[PDB]
């Protein structure tokens, strides 16, 4: 309703860097809010793509941001009569970024790994890795739960069980309030997908440079399955956290599996032991139901609700014709130990190929009326197809079907405006929460400020 579309602030990264692919707000120990931006195709210092991360201090005028340094050198370790190898070329550092407390977690989902032993190998595969930084001290740590030292032949002899070689850990990420990092790894277990959880504190305290394979004792990974419904499901393509069992002592996980059950798609709500509490099935095959997931209480009753995006959903039209527009499903959490029912609301895109529901961002309370709000991206929407972000205000009934406001892309065709979104943080300290929108195709980020 009240985001100002005229006085925008633009931050920009290097050409071809994909600056804006991922982003988050970061609050320092002094409480000052900055913006963390991922740029997964940024050139490293040897002109090879490695990705990178930028930390933008808030300024009305915007501009260029300093690059948050990480080690981009490959590592080799000869130990235990084996040779361990990390490969950082084309790793996509900054494909996801998340901030918690005074820590930034930036992941490189396509970082590769191999282990050699005589004439045998593990296979050179994208295990992924996350880089953790504490800017105000300079501390650095890493976490790569899918690296192993098992040779190829052993997976063959064991029918490829617990095969974590293609995890792409950090493909998605979220951090609980208590400081547990939860990473989505959709390639896990031969493309079923998996989740990896560890406390940030324990990641830092157990990491030393050059070790490459080390133990985080508090870590917890999800499980392999022989259920073919899960095969190639990409469970962990998206991830979120929330409160869904009425017990505030436990944290629940929300996991998107957009190709689950022969591309029907699904989203699951799980406890922190990874026991399924509920499953929400997709409506239409190949719609990518579970591409995005968001958690926020929208109807003011204090119980978290769930929003799921299916950006390739095809809507029925005259004479048995279908139009790919995208869809968003709202599930309101009921009272007591009851399941989530059918959707309370379906929001559907209007522009062909617009990919509405590609990103969904909780905005907090944008208009300060007592109900939380959301923003939904359609990165190729609007009449020109340049991209659009749509604001929906919460109410007693849940959400309004009509957006309170539409933000049209200020960037040219191809920018993917809205592909990433974050709100619910007041960057300029005016008392209203603001919205940051990434346009990785234009290597830029737009900041919209909420007004009285």
């Amino acid at each position: 309703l009240n985001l100002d579309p005229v006085q925008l602030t633009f931050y920009a990264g290097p050409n071809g860097s994909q600056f804006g692919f991922s982003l988050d707000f970061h609050k320092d120990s002094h409480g000052r809010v900055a913006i963390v931006v991922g740029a997964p195709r940024t050139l490293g210092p040897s002109q090879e793509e490695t990705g990178g991360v930028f930390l933008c201090p808030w300024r009305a005028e915007g501009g260029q941001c300093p690059s948050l340094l990480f080690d981009l050198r490959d590592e080799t370790r000869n130990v235990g009569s084996q040779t361990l190898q990390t490969f950082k070329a084309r790793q996509g550092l900054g494909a996801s970024v998340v901030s918690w407390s005074d820590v930034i977690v930036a992941c490189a989902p396509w970082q590769h790994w191999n282990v050699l032993e005589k004439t045998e190998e593990a296979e050179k595969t994208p295990v992924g890795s996350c880089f953790l930084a504490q800017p105000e001290s300079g501390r650095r740590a890493e976490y790569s739960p899918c690296r192993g030292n098992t040779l190829s032949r052993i997976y063959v002899e064991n029918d490829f069980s617990w095969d974590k070689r293609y995890c792409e850990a950090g493909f998605s990420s979220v951090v609980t309030q208590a400081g547990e990092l939860v990473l989505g790894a959709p390639g896990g277990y031969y493309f079923l997908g998996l989740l990896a959880q560890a406390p940030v504190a324990d990641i830092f305290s157990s990491y030393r440079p050059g070790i490459l394979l080390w133990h985080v004792s508090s870590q917890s990974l999800s499980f392999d399955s022989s259920n073919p419904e899960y095969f190639d499901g990409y469970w962990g393509y998206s991830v979120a956290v929330g409160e869904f069992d009425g017990d505030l002592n436990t944290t629940e996980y929300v996991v998107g599996a957009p190709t689950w059950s022969w591309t029907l798609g699904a989203v699951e709500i799980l406890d922190s032991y990874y026991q399924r509490l509920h499953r929400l099935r997709g409506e239409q095959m190949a719609s990518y139901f579970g591409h995005s997931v968001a958690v926020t209480d929208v109807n003011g009753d204090g119980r978290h609700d769930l929003l799921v995006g299916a950006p390739l959903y095809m809507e029925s039209r005259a004479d048995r014709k279908l139009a790919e527009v995208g869809r968003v499903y709202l599930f309101l959490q009921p009272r007591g130990p009851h399941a989530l029912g059918a959707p309370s609301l379906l929001l559907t895109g209007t522009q062909l190929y617009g990919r509405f529901g590609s990103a969904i961002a909780p905005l907090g309370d944008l208009d300060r009326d007592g109900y939380n709000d959301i923003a939904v991206a359609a990165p190729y929407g609007g009449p020109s197809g340049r991209g659009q972000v749509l604001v929906f205000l919460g109410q007693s009934e849940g959400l309004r079907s009509r957006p309170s406001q539409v933000l049209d892309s200020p960037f040219p065709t191809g920018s993917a405006f809205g592909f990433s979104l974050r709100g619910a943080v007041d960057i300029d300290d005016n008392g209203y929460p603001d919205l940051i929108v990434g346009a990785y195709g234009a290597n830029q980020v737009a900041v919209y400020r909420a007004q009285p």
């Epitope: 370790r77 000869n78 130990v79 235990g80 009569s81 157990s206 030393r208 070790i211 080390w214 133990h215």
Partner: antibody
């Protein structure tokens, strides 16, 4: 607190077998590699082998291949070392060992189990 | 197998001394070395892993150094509790192999 709790002192006859045990306390035995090491006064410290209790895979020093068998049971959170064809050279103190962080390190040790081979 | 040669086999030293124990490997082991302590009549405690990293809880007076085939454990300002046996172990290769040890003795 990580602690490796080994079984008691053994007095055993030559030609016989003995099975030592190492129970994990304050962690799960499958968390890391578990190693077995032998100590004698004169000959010093010798690595016998290791197990990955998650899957049962073992490595041995060739000097102990055929004498030593390492096993583990995740149900009881215990690792075992069995020594067959006991000789006077097997009179020693035996330790189980696991790393702290580094997969390949040797950081945490049990209290030791004394084995005396005698007629 | 990799031979670990540790020196000296003993030393007679005093409280407050700074002392170094060396370990020479028969080939390069690129910092894949641990240092261990055994107090009289006791079991082992790990001091250092991967050349220079202190095991959690170990006092700051212990430090590791070296590269290639040659490493050192240094104890700065000896405590009464430091008169013990010390060993290196390599894990560059299987089989893991140990040094012959160094006993810190009290000078009088």
């Amino acid at each position: 607190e990580v602690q490796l709790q080994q079984s008691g002192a053994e007095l055993v006859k030559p030609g016989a077998s003995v099975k030592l045990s190492c129970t994990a306390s304050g962690f799960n035995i499958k968390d890391t590699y578990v190693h077995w090491v032998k100590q004698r006064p004169e000959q010093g410290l010798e690595w016998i082998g290791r197990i990955d209790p998650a899957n049962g895979y073992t490595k041995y020093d060739p000097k102990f291949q055929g004498k030593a068998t390492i096993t583990a049971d995740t149900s009881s959170n215990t690792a075992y070392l069995q020594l067959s064809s006991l000789t006077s050279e097997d009179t020693a103190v035996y330790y189980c060992v696991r790393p702290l962080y580094d997969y390949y390190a040797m950081d945490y040790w049990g209290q030791g189990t004394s084995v005396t081979v005698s007629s | 197998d990799i031979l670990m040669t540790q020196s000296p086999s003993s030393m007679s030293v005093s409280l407050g001394d700074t002392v170094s124990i060396t370990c020479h490997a028969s080939q390069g082991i690129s910092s894949n070395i641990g240092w261990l302590q055994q107090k009289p009549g006791k079991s082992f405690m790990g001091l250092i892993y991967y050349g220079t990293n202190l095991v959690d809880g170990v006092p700051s007076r212990f430090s590791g150094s070296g590269s290639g085939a040659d490493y050192s454990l240094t104890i700065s300002s000896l405590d009464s509790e430091d008169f013990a046996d010390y060993y290196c172990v390599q894990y560059a290769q299987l089989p893991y192999t140990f040094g012959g040890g160094t006993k810190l003795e009290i000078k009088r």
